[PDB]
Amino acid sequence: AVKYLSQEEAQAVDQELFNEYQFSVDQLMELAGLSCATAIAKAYPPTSMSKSPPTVLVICGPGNNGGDGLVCARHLKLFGYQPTIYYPKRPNKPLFTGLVTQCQKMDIPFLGEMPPEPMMVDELYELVVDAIFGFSFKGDVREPFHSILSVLSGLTVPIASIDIPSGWDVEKGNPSGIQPDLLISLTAPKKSATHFTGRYHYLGGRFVPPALEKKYQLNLPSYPDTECVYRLQ
Amino acid sequence: AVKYLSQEEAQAVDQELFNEYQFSVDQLMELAGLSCATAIAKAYPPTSMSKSPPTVLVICGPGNNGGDGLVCARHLKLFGYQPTIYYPKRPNKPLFTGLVTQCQKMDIPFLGEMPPEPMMVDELYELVVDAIFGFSFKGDVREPFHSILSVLSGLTVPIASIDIPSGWDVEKGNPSGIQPDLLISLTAPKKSATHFTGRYHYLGGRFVPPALEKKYQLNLPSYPDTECVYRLQ
Ligand SMILES: [Cl-]
Ligand SMILES: [Cl-]
User: Fold this and answer.
1) Which residue among A34, A89, A160, B57 is least crowded, i.e. fewest CB within 10 A of its CB?
2) Beta strands of chain B (E only): which ranges?
3) Cα of A67 from ligand 1 centre, angstroms
């Protein structure tokens, strides 16, 4: 059975990957994002949806989890979804500006504003992807994300959170916060994932050197054949 | 660190103030209310709000917390907010009838009915003030407040609760009840305030004789200079 990283182990693994193994950020972010998109398409496949193409709102935060979201959105389009992105706070680095351009050019719209009522989110978007905050946030929830998360917690449509449910604490979680229906753990699950109560928990980020896995006793399962996602239980 | 009163200590402090120190109710309620309005303006200052003047719905209960709410509302108006009040159950005592007249004459509207859906509350009112029940309720939530609280718990806009979040138990709290974004503890925090998870917790009711403070080991911080509120952490 698979380990659940503490916030410190997770930073170690991350630091290793970028420093020992010398993976660049682009690379892991591409694979992370592809893995999110893939998990979303396995859990909420387009044929199972009422609209066609199915609609998805991807809300990207101000760091890496956001970057993951942009990558996720772009692959979602190619999997036959109709994504829309809301990216209120964008770092001015070409990683992020490249991601925005890539999505613009694939006719993926960036909204000027978050629809202000849950019901409106629900009628426009069959699925919302929470790419707001990742593991390394501590935090604390400054606007406009407080207000965003407050809308999210009133939705009726499912939420899919990347790595961690934004607003939860990475180890202890949050009973009063958002309650995703899908969680996509990247690399390995974090401790907060124990408090997870949605239907689907997938593991993604299949780029773990088997040495690293062993060094931190991750007990990652065997991803089947050519798959970049595994559904945990 | 500041103490958190039990429900019995709080009744003692209160009884003292009105009996030993011989503060009248008018007096402390004026200061309490001013303090609430002030904390609201520090946490949600008008310039930070999308509407101008910013709108606020103040829901007043059937006792003192309600009284606090009416005072709060009247000072909010003078701070440049556009308050509206909902006061379904009004004691026929001139304290309360004076408060109502004061607000009426400042063109503060009292609604005939609570807007029945959260979404409607959200579109009309940028902030809602919960002045329904204070510490000395036990309770139990009779209509129309059950239904009111049920709407409040679906809002997207922030709630500011005066002294205690109505519907919580004063010492143990309530996971299934409303979740204010601002709590204004009066005099000193009550035990329920430990379960508080909103962004802002202010301390108000700066009228504590330093003797009383000492007698109950309150450890009230030093309110800065001329301030009637201190933000706790
Ligand atoms: Cl902020
Ligand atoms: Cl009743």
Assistant:
1) A89
2) 55-60, 82-86, 127-131, 159-162, 182-186, 200-204, 230-231
3) 21
Chain A contact probe: residue of B44, B50, B51, B122 with most A CBs at under 10 A? B122
**In chain A, positions 134-173, which contact chain B (CB-CB < 8 Å)?**
140-141, 146-147, 150-151, 154
Cα–Cα distance for residue pair B147/A180, rounded to 1 Å: 27
Measure A145 CA to ligand 1 centroid, in angstroms: 8
Strand ordering across the sheet containing B82-86: B82-86, B55-60, B127-131, B159-162, B182-186, B200-204, B230-231
Experimental technique of record: X-ray
Which tokens go with B35?
A: 């303090």
- B156–A146 CB contact, under 8 Å: no
DSSP element (H, E) containing A200: strand A200-204
Q: Is B197 on the interface with A (CB under 8 A)?
A: yes
Residue found by looking up tokens 């798959």 in the block = A227
Rg (chain B; Cα; Å):
16
Burial of B160 (0-12, 13-18, 19+ CB in 10 A): buried
Bridge partners (DSSP) of residue B55 are B82
Domain ranges of chain B: 1-233
> CB of B123 within 8 Å of any CB in chain A?
yes
Question: CB-CB: which of A117, A140, A175 is closest to B122?
Answer: A117
Residues in chain B, overall count: 233
CATH, domain B1-233, list 3.40.50.1970, 3.10.20.340, 3.40.50.10260, 3.30.565.10: 3.40.50.10260
Q: Is B117 an interface residue toward A (CB < 8 Å)? A: no
Q: Looking at beta carbons, which residues of chain A come within 8 Å of B175?
A: 175-176
> How deeply is B229 buried, as exposed, middle or buried, from its count of CB atoms within 10 A (0-12, 13-18, 19+)?
buried
Residues 6+ apart with CB under 8 A from A19: none
